[PDB]
């Protein structure tokens, strides 16, 4: 009944927990240890990585396409792959809403290994995974309404033509599955425990541009999807398509007051944010961010619905509890109580959600336990192992968005401050603030047993595979050859690293010259990882234990160019070195 | 010594961090070890738009179109061997520049490309009386000029040089030529002596090559010569830079006026001045030991009043395997790093001067395990004659087991260890991304920032002038400026509303948006995102800041602030609309 857990990892011991952080406005994910909330990896997707050369090399501007033009990414939603409602380790994947992009992270080497832009829609937003039977389905909101064709004849919001899209990508092979219109806008979602439904908050139901416009409505919805009729719909041939994407697309609006087969749209207050389900899969809870509480869809309500057998989409709400001013955010403790940040009134509030139920049906019940101050102005939280059935009620994170004086002076900008929160017991007990740059927003927890990582690299690796192809049509064996291959104005350098010499130590080239640097580090001691650096050439990146990384640069500079080792790899780390002669033109 | 930082409570210290091949410059919390902020330097951050920016990037100059950097040696402005907390100077190794970042707004105010040079390597700022220089060492040999007639590193017009930098205007000072190469180096507590580790007195390429010489040496430089003969105008001046050059090397066994090479094993690395003033420290590396070379023997020494260059050195402690760095804890003990034993050692310096002349005393103190493979370590203020002795962090760089696994990559380990007493005690072991070199601490209060933006701060001054060119008042102005196929968008922000919520352009047109955030309540910063454009940044409480994209796709496109304002945030939005261009002339 007490909150007692030990905060402290010292030297020599290890966390319990994997946590996984967006990086907010930064673009990457953040590997965490919990409890000590020390920052273990970076793992680059949207950003430029100058230490491993993400957006420089050829294997990660394969992966990321035409994205690859980007520099900037905004990721908010991390989450894991599952399969019977539990995580099984196998996959990460974000939101982009800068660049409208959804990427997938391999946990067992902790790289992102594919990204998708996705077609005619702007701003992925809210992000969530199919629970049961498994992660069959990536869900994504597009956030803002755009005209269809976007091709600047039609530019209001109001035409009908002018919507936004649910997006549903598969998990496995990072492709398009449908896309689904709907009326208003989406915000988050958030799927159930059998597969059949997910459902996202929708804040712009006016289709409004201005502020004004967009709070006129007393309430707007959850919009509820029934997943086995998109399915259904696209098995038969029965949806179209939009601009040059392949992707089925169903209509999901309301027209003339008639329902899709698709949607359902369950009439919240006001301006909702959080789309969160409960961990005994009863609930899609919808905090009501302008309204001072959340409202709880019955999931077991929903089949009725959408059969027809119920007279008022508001018959699927069964609470709509007084919390606080400002809630945007619910999490769970699989015990039955849900918590939820008041952006406002800067709390987290405990409660119980069976009470909760009781007292939308008249029963004088207080069904509120805590309210914890936070310090200041919570955006989401998350509990461990909260988007699963086995929710375990350890530790509670809320991600505060102004830090003011709560850590030391850093000039205007201000770290974002993500409070660790014990919640085994039955008070919430405030033990550690994180200070975090660019504003992560969410977060998820992972046990230590539920991740499992590659210590090194194996050789066929899908990530550098294109680069192994390549190497395949110069007649190249990547594991142990050193030779330079020229073709015309193009150089290929092939060459493996040991520590601490590279395998290739000088090679001639032309100026003007498109020179590709491949490296093969042969290390098969583990952490053993070399780099690459061009001098004055703007080349760096990462080669760990067995990998193959590649880059392409063109030598626009006459003279004597050194290149170096950039990880510290051995004692003779800073002779590890060589030179590139550049031929006057 | 207090070592966890409740909720609530504040760090004793500031802590800088390189962040190495990443490129940035972190902020820590200390002893928390906390990370509080990062200060983008030669990275392109998503998040705050530098790189991007008209502001950074006219602050990077050409180099802007490097998407990367390699930073190892934070370091803190100083005024008669003092911190002085005005600016913290940075080194690229990638692409040979010099960063200095504003202590006052954290952020990078200059950079500069060190002309005729490959890879700035080693870098300390003058301490007395204060950093009127900023000391960077150019890493590796080249040809001069390097134009692709001559590759040999053996040719007489081949070779590396010092480098010193004006701190004040970030504009080149004076280039020294040497013999060998440089690594790292550090100023004296008089401002007449600098000093640098050399590694590659053999001039070679390969492993071997460099490892010939039993000794190279580190190269002392009377920073007074030099000043003197520039002020009398005997220098060269190398290719299209007027930054005066001066030889430093040897002419057939003769020595310069502006360097003394002093003999030292073997490829040595750590170049660091006890906070007494009294010694130049070397880190020996392949040789199992330091050199410590007396700083009030070198007038004796360019004077010639000594016979062997060896006779300014007065310690040879032997150490263990792999001396990499030394710092001090100002009580007269140093601390090395041993990268093969993977230790710490602490010893006594005066003891291992007379250790040095015959007099058996064990001048060892102690050898604290470190996990695993120790680089750099600093002890706090450890660079200033106020080296306090409290916190010593030594920078490991293979963590293997210390914390959960994370794939093929790991993290380093950057270990803080109590030095308050006689006993080193290891506290913290503290993950860190892409192998920071050096950090530097200072105290809570020798750092004062800034919580708003003074409207008239350089870092923004060019776009105050474009406004004004344009008749815009920043303060106020809400306006679209349309010159040609530019269009230059003017707006305030306050939250949760940008100032200009929509306009529209002609398809291809490149278009600036300047945003100026007009509200005064710290903390609340907006961002500014063109959704599939590529475009990011962040805008302060009274900043401005400026961004350029080409509006390359019809019709319409939203933007939104990326900074959590307000609780109407998610609604502070606007809308680009872009007319088709086969609806415009052709
Ligand atoms: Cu390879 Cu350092
Ligand atoms: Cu301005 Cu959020
Ligand atoms: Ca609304
Ligand atoms: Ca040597
Ligand atoms: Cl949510
Ligand atoms: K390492
Ligand atoms: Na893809
Ligand atoms: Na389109």
Redesign the pocket.
């Known amino acids: 009944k007490e909150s007692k857990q030990k905060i402290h990892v010292g030297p020599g011991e290890l966390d319990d927990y994997y946590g996984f952080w967006s990086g907010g406005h930064q673009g990457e994910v953040r590997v965490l240890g919990v409890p000590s909330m020390r920052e273990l990896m970076r793992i680059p997707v949207f950003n430029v990585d100058s230490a491993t050369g993400w957006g420089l090399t050829n294997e990660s501007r394969h992966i990321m396409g035409d994205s690859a033009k980007f520099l900037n990414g905004d990721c908010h939603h991390p989450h894991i792959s599952m399969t019977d409602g539990k995580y099984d380790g196998k996959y990460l994947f974000i939101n982009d809403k800068a660049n409208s992009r959804v990427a997938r992270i391999r946990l067992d080497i902790m790289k992102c290994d594919k990204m998708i832009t996705v077609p005619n829609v702007q701003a992925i937003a809210g992000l969530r995974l199919q629970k049961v039977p498994h992660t069959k389905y990536v869900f994504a909101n597009a956030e803002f309404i755009i005209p269809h064709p976007n091709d600047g004849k039609v530019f209001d919001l109001q035409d009908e033509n002018s919507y936004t899209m649910y997006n549903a990508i598969d998990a496995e092979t990072m492709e398009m599955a449908f896309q689904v219109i709907v009326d208003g806008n989406l915000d988050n979602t958030d799927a159930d425990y059998t597969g059949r439904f997910a459902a996202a908050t929708c804040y712009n139901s006016e289709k409004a541009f201005d502020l004004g416009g967009m709070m006129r409505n007393e309430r707007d919805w959850v919009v509820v999807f029934d997943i086995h009729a998109v399915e259904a719909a696209v098995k038969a041939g029965d949806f179209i398509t939009l601009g040059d994407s392949k992707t089925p697309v169903l209509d999901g609006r309301k027209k003339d007051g008639k329902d899709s087969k698709f949607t359902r749209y369950v009439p919240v207050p006001k301006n909702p944010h959080g789309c969160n389900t409960s961990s005994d899969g009863k609930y899609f809870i919808a905090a009501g961010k302008l309204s001072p509480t959340c409202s709880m869809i019955a999931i077991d309500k929903l089949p009725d619905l959408f059969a027809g057998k119920l007279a008022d989409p508001r018959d699927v709400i069964v609470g709509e509890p007084e919390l606080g001013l400002g809630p945007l955010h619910t999490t769970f403790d699989g015990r039955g109580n849900a918590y939820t940040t008041l952006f406002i009134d800067s709390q987290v509030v405990k409660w119980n959600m069976e009470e909760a139920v009781r007292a939308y049906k008249g029963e004088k019940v207080n069904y509120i336990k805590q309210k914890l101050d936070v310090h200041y102005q919570p955006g989401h939280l998350h509990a461990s192992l909260c988007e699963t059935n086995e929710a375990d009620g350890k530790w509670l994170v809320a991600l505060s968005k102004f830090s003011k004086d709560r850590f030391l002076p850093v000039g205007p900008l201000h770290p974002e401050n993500d409070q660790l929160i014990d919640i085994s017991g039955d008070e919430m007990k405030l033990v550690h603030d994180g200070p975090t740059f660019a504003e992560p927003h969410d977060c998820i927890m992972a046990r230590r047993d539920q991740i499992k990582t590659k210590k090194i690299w194996d050789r066929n690796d899908p990530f550098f595979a294109p680069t192994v192809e390549m190497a395949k049509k110069d007649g190249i064996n990547l594991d142990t050859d050193n030779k330079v291959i020229r073709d015309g104005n193009k150089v290929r350098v092939y060459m493996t690293?040991m520590?601490?010499?590279?395998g290739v130590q000088e090679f001639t080239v032309k100026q003007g010259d498109e020179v590709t640097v491949t490296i093969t580090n042969i290390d098969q001691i583990e952490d053993?990882?070399?780099?690459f650096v061009v001098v004055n050439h703007g080349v760096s990146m990462e080669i760990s234990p067995q990998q193959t990384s590649s880059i392409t640069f063109v030598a626009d500079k006459p003279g004597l160019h050194w290149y170096?080792?950039?990880?510290?790899?051995?004692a003779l780390?800073?002779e590890?070195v060589g030179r590139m002669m550049v031929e006057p033109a």
């Open positions: 690293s520590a601490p010499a590279f053993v990882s070399h780099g170096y080792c950039s990880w510290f790899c051995h780390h800073m590890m």
